[PDB]
Design a protein around this ligand. Structure first.
Ligand SMILES: CSC[C@H]1O[C@@H](n2cnc3c(N)ncnc32)[C@H](O)[C@@H]1O
Ligand SMILES: N[C@@H](CCN[C@H](Cc1c[nH]cn1)C(=O)O)C(=O)O
Length: 259
């Protein structure tokens, strides 16, 4: 009940900060600072307990749902801002970016992806760290898909700056449109994708029998800055590991073939 205020305050701020950042590139610092606070807020044990204590299903669910959407748009823009800034000759980071760009290597596991493997990232974004960091680290081919053309465009330009000689392709194709989906060994889903589990189910018959999927997600209080986990259809995708990260904004669920 008491916490309710904070979330509605965040929702209003994120709504205001987003509209302001679009029309004027002066309120960037404000948005980045807001996301740095939000990132810290969801990793605070105090507010986690307060959040979990709150019950009222309908109202809470709608509030979480409303927060998921606005923060989705904010992450998109914060990536665009970082992309434009790098292209303008200035590397940068934030509390938010520093949090997530840590354990991108060991999302599947330590020394899991080899040189011969091929990773597919669903929802690459304007600043595709995952593509760049995996490509340079493992020396593997990596693909990125995004429904946003701005993300595709900037993504290609950023890849060209940071990893020009690595095998990195980004398109606006869907999993069904990908020609060499059968050769894909690893698949990462971005947390903030509302159709990620819908595309998971689809990818079963498209992918080979040795494929492994890393689904980024956030349950409980993290669900305000993430789309949560879900049950998967029986005798298809099997959750072999749920990787909770108490100091990171998103957790990881590993899916493999049932046989
Ligand atoms: C900013 S990182 C998140 C990215 O995922 C992308 N995204 C959201 N939903 C989907 C989807 N269903 N398929 C592919 N990419 C998506 C968004 O366009 C955004 O750039
Ligand atoms: N561009 C990024 C992909 C987007 N990263 C976000 C991180 C996040 C989770 N919650 C809030 N922010 C996501 O995984 O949904 C990459 O290359 O990993």
């Amino acid at each position: 009940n008491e916490i309710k205020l904070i979330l509605q305050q965040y929702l209003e701020k994120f709504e205001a900060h987003y509209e302001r950042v679009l029309q004027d590139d002066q309120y960037i610092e404000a948005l980045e600072t807001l996301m740095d606070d939000y990132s810290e807020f969801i990793l605070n044990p105090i507010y986690e307990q307060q959040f979990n204590a709150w019950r009222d299903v309908e109202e809470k669910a709608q509030l979480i749902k409303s927060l998921q959407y606005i923060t989705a748009q904010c992450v998109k823009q914060v990536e665009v801002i970082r992309a434009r800034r790098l292209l303008d000759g200035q590397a940068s980071t934030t509390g938010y970016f520093d949090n997530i760009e840590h354990c991108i290597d060991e999302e599947f596991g330590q020394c899991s992806i080899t040189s011969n493997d091929k990773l597919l990232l669903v929802g690459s974004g304007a600043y595709p760290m995952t593509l760049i960091q995996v490509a340079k680290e493992t020396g593997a081919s990596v693909i990125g898909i995004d429904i946003d053309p701005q993300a595709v465009d900037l993504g290609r330009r950023i890849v060209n700056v940071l990893a020009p000689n690595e095998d990195i392709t980004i398109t606006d194709q869907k999993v069904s449109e990908l020609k060499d989906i059968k050769d894909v060994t690893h698949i990462i889903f971005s947390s903030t994708i509302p159709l990620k589990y819908s595309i998971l189910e689809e990818l079963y018959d498209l992918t080979n029998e040795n494929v492994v999927v890393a689904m980024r997600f956030g349950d409980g209080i993290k669900a305000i800055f993430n789309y949560p986990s879900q049950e998967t259809a029986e005798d298809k995708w099997q959750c072999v590991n749920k990787h909770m990260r108490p100091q990171q904004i998103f957790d990881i669920a590993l899916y493999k073939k049932a046989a």
